[PDB]
């Protein structure tokens, strides 16, 4: 286990495991904004009981976000409850406020929930088969860009921030929003008991 | 009050005798006074049990050494 | 439970007394302290007599 | 008003029939027990303790001891001298011995640890 | 993680000892040590960690003590507290309060002065 | 169970205090050091007076 | 003396000399010296019935009959003064052959050295 | 009387064997003598359990040292 | 045939402690001593030593936790484990698993930092 | 409860004995030091 533990320390921390991975971070105000905010909260309200927050890396958050956007189910940070992607409440990042991170992750989770509903499609009929095929082609096109982003993240040569990733996905995110609305109207709005001809 | 205390002590002695407690008049009176003065009955009972156990151990030691 | 508690307390007391006696036996510089005091008294007597 | 500790020591000396010097280990054990936190007595209610004693005596077919206990309890209640009747009743119940059951003569084996 | 400058458990225990005993912190040092020992001991889980179960138990206990009005008042206060949502650990506070309830009819067994005898 | 816990804590405290007292009484070689210093001073006085 | 008899019994059961069982002897002396609450049952017949029921519960009906016969023989022999106590002890020390002995984990041996 | 003692000891050994108590004739005789001498059955049961645990520990130690 | 050097229960317990704490064996010495004290303590026999009885108790406990699906899954897994016959002490492992089960519905009573005082 | 009490008493006894042995081990050295210093002073005087 010692050699394996050394690799495990050097192969990316088990933070994705429920074991708390403590990672060293800069205590600079701009870099320790989460810690400074915790300190201010601790200083300001004598009734404030510190909730257990999980520290996640920004790169780790980005990777998990890409995996969610890649349609992966059973994410650790974003939990799927009743088909709704929900963020785990005990997650914090060094550079974001819990509320700000929660808001951004909530927007991402809403788009992920849309994808998830779209991801569940079985294709039982010729028209539904064609819609599935087109959806698959769209998802392929999106996964290509997602894989390129993941490759750039893996190279780790350049600072990639969540804002940069969101901006890169902005056209794709707009296309996804339009597709979600169109799909909801074309399929989700169709009553289940409608005749296949009527559907 | 004195007559009542004497009657209570006599009643306690009679109860001990019927129950074969092994308490004498002085020990029974002391226990009654302690309980009336607020002594925890569990502490008093433990003390009485320990004294009886010590007397039985001393009698067993005297019979084993003789 | 009361009987168990009382027995445990009695055993604790007995063990404390036994430990006191054992520590007195094994710690026992006291005899050396008494012998040093005796040698001090003898040296004081030799100083007074000289 | 002799301190409770001195009274308990005198009581122990009187009951055991030994000098204070011969009961030092037993005195230490007693002091440890009395100062030790003891679980609450089985019954801390005078009427509940009396009823439990009566039921136990009737169940053991010891009617004479039950009658004697009832008479002593009536006398104690009417005398009104004791402030904490429940404590005395609990003590008496805890010290009760079945007269039919031959006192279990403490086996000489207890002497092994006395030395 | 918003940890209010919660004076250390030692300081809180000292303040509690001083308040309950009515003596200064310096006079409760042995009691403070006893408190630290008690607090440091592993305690079995509380009988009830459910707010509604604790409320029902409190109501039943108050009714058994013939405090039906106090049971209704407790239920109303509990509803108000739950709606206020200020307390993070409602179950713990409810369990503590239930455990600390005293029947006014049962004469407090005055802790005999005799406990002081063993302190020497 | 609560009573048992409290009794155990009390017994631990009492035993710790008893151990402290026993160690203070029996370990305390301070008396032996003082008596050795006294015998040294008495021997020094007996040497100066001779 | 009962102490010497108990020591000889311990040595015989353990298969070790008296000097090797000193700690166990001390433990036994401590256990015996503790004040015990009165036993639940001091009646020979109640103890015999409890032993029979316990033997039957282990589906050992033949062993239950053998136990009842041995108890009858012991009662008629009149050698034991406290028949109820001995019967209660035997019942308390009885083990169900069907209930797998909770094998004392080898881990206890680690501290023995 | 001797025949009665022998019969009682044989019955006790048979009962112990059928019940899988693990007691030998000497240990069973010692237990019988202790019970006849007034030993508390709860204390005796605790002692028996402790002795069995000690015997198992001693047998494990003897097998480990051999 | 040199049965893999299954390090003695003390060494295995030390490795387990190191794994659970995420620290080296040298950093868990006090915890190792605590473990040795616990392991050397006499533990009462488990309530149930029957594999099928233990499985039924687990199913009942899961049903009490309103986990009927988990109770069925537990019964099926227990049947499969019993049929596989790889484990020598099925009752002991079942008792361990029952002791280690956690109720997802009971909000974790966040262990007050004060518990660390006794850890030293 | 009885089993717990008996086990606790046994563990207390064993722990007390172990602590006694450990204290004896951790608490002859003086005699050896005295002998060494006596040898050294005698050697110094003889050499001198």
Swiss-Prot record, chain A:
Q: In which tissues is it expressed?
A: Widely expressed, with highest levels in heart and skeletal muscle and moderate levels in brain.
Location(s) in or outside the cell: Cytoplasm, Cytoskeleton, Microtubule organizing center, Centrosome
Question: Which cystines does this chain contain?
Answer: none
Job of this protein = Component of the gamma-tubulin ring complex (gTuRC) which mediates microtubule nucleation. The gTuRC regulates the minus-end nucleation of alpha-beta tubulin heterodimers that grow into microtubule protafilaments, a critical step in centrosome duplication and spindle formation.
Q: How does it assemble?
A: Component of the gamma-tubulin ring complex (gTuRC) consisting of TUBGCP2, TUBGCP3, TUBGCP4, TUBGCP5 and TUBGCP6 and gamma-tubulin TUBG1 or TUBG2. TUBGCP2, TUBGCP3, TUBGCP4, TUBGCP5 and TUBGCP6 assemble in a 5:5:2:1:1 stoichiometry; each is associated with a gamma-tubulin, thereby arranging 14 gamma-tubulins in a helical manner. Gamma-tubulin at the first position is blocked by TUBGCP3 at the last position, allowing 13 protafilaments to grow into a microtubule.
Q: Which family does it belong to?
A: Belongs to the TUBGCP family.
Q: What is this protein called?
A: Gamma-tubulin complex component 5
> What is the species of this protein?
Homo sapiens (Human)
The part of the entire sequence present here spans: 210 to 432 of 1024
Curated annotation (Swiss-Prot), chains B, H:
The keyword Cytoplasm is annotated on this UniProt entry: yes
Please indicate which superkingdom the organism of origin belongs to: Eukaryota
Cellular compartment(s) = Cytoplasm, Cytoskeleton, Microtubule organizing center, Centrosome; Cytoplasm, Cytoskeleton, Spindle
Give the GO cellular component terms, alphabetically.
centrosome; cytosol; gamma-tubulin ring complex; interphase microtubule organizing center; spindle
Q: Which UniProt keywords apply?
A: Acetylation, Cytoplasm, Cytoskeleton
Biological process annotations from GO: gamma-tubulin complex localization; microtubule nucleation by interphase microtubule organizing center; mitotic spindle assembly
Keyword Acetylation belongs to the record: yes
**Family note:** Belongs to the MOZART1 family.
User: What function is annotated for this protein?
Assistant: Required for the recruitment and the assembly of the gamma-tubulin ring complex (gTuRC) at the centrosome. The gTuRC regulates the minus-end nucleation of alpha-beta tubulin heterodimers that grow into microtubule protafilaments, a critical step in centrosome duplication and spindle formation.
| Assembly | Associates with the gamma-tubulin ring complex (gTuRC) consisting of TUBGCP2, TUBGCP3, TUBGCP4, TUBGCP5 and TUBGCP6 and gamma-tubulin TUBG1 or TUBG2; within the complex, interacts with TUBGCP3 and TUBGCP6 to form a luminal bridge with actin that stabilizes the initial structure during complex assembly. Interacts with TUBG1.
Name the record gives this protein: Mitotic-spindle organizing protein 1
Organism of this sequence: Homo sapiens
| Gene coding for it | MZT1
From Swiss-Prot, chains C, F:
Origin, by domain of life? Answer: Eukaryota
Q: Modified residue Phosphoserine is at which positions?
A: 27
Changes after translation: Phosphorylated NEDD1 can interact with gamma-tubulin for targeting the gamma-tubulin ring complex (gTuRC) to the centrosome, an important step for spindle formation.
Query: Where does the UniProt annotation locate this protein?
Result: Cytoplasm, Cytoskeleton, Microtubule organizing center, Centrosome
State what this protein does: Required for mitosis progression. Promotes the nucleation of microtubules from the spindle.
Q: How does it assemble?
A: Interacts with FAM29A. Interacts with HSPA1A and HSPA1B. Interacts with gamma-tubulin in a HSPA1A/B-dependent manner.
What protein name applies here? Protein NEDD1
Organism, per UniProt? Homo sapiens
Q: Which residues of the full protein are shown?
A: 611 to 660 of 660
UniProtKB/Swiss-Prot annotation, chain D:
Q: Where in the cell is it found?
A: Cytoplasm, Cytoskeleton, Microtubule organizing center, Centrosome
**Disulfide connectivity?**
none
Phosphoserine: residues bearing it: 108
Tissue-wise, where is it found? Ubiquitously expressed.
Family per record: Belongs to the TUBGCP family.
Role according to the record: Component of the gamma-tubulin ring complex (gTuRC) which mediates microtubule nucleation. The gTuRC regulates the minus-end nucleation of alpha-beta tubulin heterodimers that grow into microtubule protafilaments, a critical step in centrosome duplication and spindle formation.
Subunit composition?
A: Component of the gamma-tubulin ring complex (gTuRC) consisting of TUBGCP2, TUBGCP3, TUBGCP4, TUBGCP5 and TUBGCP6 and gamma-tubulin TUBG1 or TUBG2. TUBGCP2, TUBGCP3, TUBGCP4, TUBGCP5 and TUBGCP6 assemble in a 5:5:2:1:1 stoichiometry; each is associated with a gamma-tubulin, thereby arranging 14 gamma-tubulins in a helical manner. Gamma-tubulin at the first position is blocked by TUBGCP3 at the last position, allowing 13 protafilaments to grow into a microtubule.
Please report the name of this protein according to its UniProt entry.
Answer: Gamma-tubulin complex component 3
Q: Which organism is it from?
A: Homo sapiens (Human)
Query: Which gene holds the coding sequence for this protein?
Result: TUBGCP3
